[PDB]
Amino acid sequence: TLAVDEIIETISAITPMAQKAKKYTPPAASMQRSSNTIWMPVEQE
Amino acid sequence: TANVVVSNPRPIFTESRSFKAVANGKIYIGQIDTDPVNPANQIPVYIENEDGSHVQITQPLIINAAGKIVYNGQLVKIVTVQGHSMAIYDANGSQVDYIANVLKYDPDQYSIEADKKFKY
Amino acid sequence: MQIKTKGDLVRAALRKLGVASDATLTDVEPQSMQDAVDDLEAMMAEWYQDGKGIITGYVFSDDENPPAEGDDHGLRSSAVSAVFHNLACRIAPDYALEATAKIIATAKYGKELLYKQTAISRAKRAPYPSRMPTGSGNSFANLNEWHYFPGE
Amino acid sequence: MQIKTKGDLVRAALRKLGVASDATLTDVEPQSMQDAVDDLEAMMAEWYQDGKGIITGYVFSDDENPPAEGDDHGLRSSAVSAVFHNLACRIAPDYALEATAKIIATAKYGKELLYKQTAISRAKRAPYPSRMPTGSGNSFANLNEWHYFPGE
Amino acid sequence: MQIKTKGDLVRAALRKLGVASDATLTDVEPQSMQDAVDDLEAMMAEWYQDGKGIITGYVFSDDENPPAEGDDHGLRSSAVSAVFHNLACRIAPDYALEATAKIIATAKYGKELLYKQTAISRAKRAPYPSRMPTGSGNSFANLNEWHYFPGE
């Protein structure tokens, strides 16, 4: 009934996409009133 | 007008002190005020089929678990020729009841009796 | 063993009581046979407390079987004497009799012997408490970090 | 069980007393049967002190259904013997009678057996007092910042 | 319960005593009913010592109601057996009888069970004395605190 100290590891995950995706943290104080939404301009033509 | 009353014709056989049917019990019908199980005192019995065939069977009538008489696994209606005395025994073999004089007339087949009796 | 049915147990009990035996020229009455069979069923149901009492192997009849007598009781070869002696003691008061002191002593001895093996089997020791170490002498139950006993 | 109603209980008690049974040539009046069933109901209600006494499964009949006689009792297969032995003892004085020693002994044994499992269930230890600490080796308590035991 | 009146209690008492029952062939005489009702009222008033005795729910009559018999007693289901057993014991000597050992034992047991719950309720622990500190481990919890228990 007494087990042993050796966990049979099974899975191995890899995170390429979310590790090369840029992460942004806009100011939370502003975002609370702004309803979790922020606008950024687009290159002018 | 009223001509026929809805009722069931199937008899029920229960115990004497409790409300439970005499299961796999036996019925002996013989002459009045006698000992029915003695084969000398018994009288003929007849299954009255749906078409009134009157087919005779042996004496010890077997009771279902519901109190209804059976024969070959099907409920039957049983008639006699005369007033009889009844001995109802339980499955173990105990005497559930003994009655010296019981008489009940067949309620059906009035047409044939009237045919014979009344005047043309 | 020629005692194999509930009816056989009932007949032995009645003979032991003297109510209905072939050594007294009396025959068993079916009304008393049904009563004694009911008494035996109730007594064994009281003994075998739904799996926590005296284990005998006695088989309890079902209702779809109309006649209780004539069924094998299922007891082992050695429970027969205890069962029918206790039955005689139980059913004596119906006839305003008193089972003799020999029958009472045999019933007591039989009930004790009936429960003896179950008592030995149920006299089991508890596991170690979960707050009690396993020691370091138990090398295997360590180096697996089993420093304390499992418990429960 | 062949005994499935309060009337069966009373009939078994009468049979054990010897006052009446399926074999007797004289029987008791239905008024006597109703009185005995009322006594059984009173004794069962006394045993079951509104949930703080003996638990058996007895189903107390309601006045709306006319015959309290004829209702299923609801007792388990192992309580019937105790219940009707105690009933025989209780209603014996009606018939200028005194239950015999075997009946009294079986009644006492049956009542004890009836209460055994409820007694084991009610042998429950109390929680730790509100002032007893949890210790420092109590990791679960250390998580929840419980230095002292909850007082319940 | 089929016993819901003082007359029903008295009738049960007499039936137990063997004075007036259908187990025998005797009928209840109205003089016996009246005397036994008066005895029941006196015994209940003796028990319930104006609130400082046995609490049962018994409802005491008034002079305005002419027939005392015919009213509900008000007792709970579990008090009826004790009440009528003790009533039978009390009213036995009027007929130069002595209630049998079973009735005496059942009356004792019933009275004990009657007072059991009241005893559990009344087993109360008095508060701390007037000259007892409440401890330094309490004030920090209740910044107001008091240093000493009030008492009473």
Swiss-Prot record, chain A:
Marked site (Essential for binding to the capsid assembly scaffolding protein) residue numbers: D5
Highest taxon listed in the record's lineage: Viruses
Residue ranges, annotated region (Binding to the capsid assembly scaffolding protein): 1-45
Compartments reported by the entry: Virion
Mutagenesis / variant outcome for changing E6A: Decreased phage growth
Outcome recorded upon mutating D5A: Impaired phage growth; inability of the mutant capsid protein to interact properly with scaffolding protein
Subunit structure: Interacts (via N-terminus) with the capsid assembly scaffolding protein (via C-terminus); capsid proteins and scaffolding proteins form building blocks that assemble to form the procapsid. Interacts with the portal protein.
Family to which this protein belongs: Belongs to the P22 phage major capsid protein family.
This protein's domain notes: The insertion domain (I domain) plays an important role in the folding of the capsid protein by acting as an intramolecular chaperone.
Annotated function: Self-assembles to form an icosahedral capsid with a T=7 symmetry.
Name of this protein: Major capsid protein
Taxonomic source organism: Salmonella phage P22
UniProtKB/Swiss-Prot annotation, chain B:
Annotated localization: Virion
Oligomer status and interactors: Homotrimer. Interacts with the host O-antigen lipopolysaccharides; this interaction induces cleavage of host O-antigen. Interacts with tail hub protein gp10; this interaction anchors 6 fibers onto the tail hub hexamer.
Family: Belongs to the P22likevirus tail fiber protein family.
Function text: Structural component of the short non-contractile tail. The tail comprises six spikes that mediate primary attachment to the host cell lipopolysaccharides (LPS) and display endorhamnosidase enzymatic activity, hydrolyzing the alpha-1,3-O-glycosidic linkage between rhamnose and galactose of the O-antigen polysaccharide. Digestion of the LPS brings the capsid near the cell outer membrane.
Entry remark concerning the domains of this protein: The interdigitation of the polypeptide chains at the C-termini is important to protrimer formation in the folding pathway and to thermostability of the mature protein.
Identification of the protein by name: Tail spike protein
Species name: Salmonella phage P22 (Bacteriophage P22)
Residues of the full protein shown: 5 to 124 of 667
Curated annotation (Swiss-Prot), chains C, D, E:
Biological processes, Gene Ontology terms: symbiont entry into host cell via disruption of host cell envelope; symbiont entry into host cell via disruption of host cell wall peptidoglycan; symbiont genome ejection through host cell envelope, short tail mechanism
GO cellular component terms, A-Z: virus tail
Source superkingdom: Viruses
UniProt-annotated location(s): Virion
Single GO molecular function: hydrolase activity
The keyword Lyase is assigned to this record: yes
Keywords, sorted A to Z: Degradation of host cell envelope components during virus entry, Degradation of host peptidoglycans during virus entry, Hydrolase, Late protein, Lyase, Viral genome ejection through host cell envelope, Viral penetration into host cytoplasm, Viral short tail ejection system, Virion, Virus entry into host cell
Free-text note on domains in this protein's UniProt record: The N-terminus changes its conformation when transitioning from the preassembly state to the postassembly state.
Annotated function: Tail protein that binds the portal ring and functions as a head completion protein. 12 copies of gp4 form a structural ring at the bottom of the portal ring. Together with gp10 and gp26, gp4 is required for stabilization of the condensed DNA within the capsid; perhaps by plugging the hole through which the DNA enters. Plays a role in ejection of the bacteriophage DNA into the host cell at the initiation of infection. Functions as an exolysin that catalyzes the cleavage of the glycosidic bonds between N-acetylmuramic acid and N-acetylglucosamine residues in peptidoglycans.
Subunit structure: Monomer; homododecamer upon binding to the portal ring. Interacts (via C-terminus) with the portal protein; this interaction participates in the head completion. Interacts with the Tail hub protein gp10. Interacts with the tail needle protein gp26.
Protein name: Head-to-tail adapter protein gp4
Organism: Salmonella phage P22 (Bacteriophage P22)
Primary gene name: 4
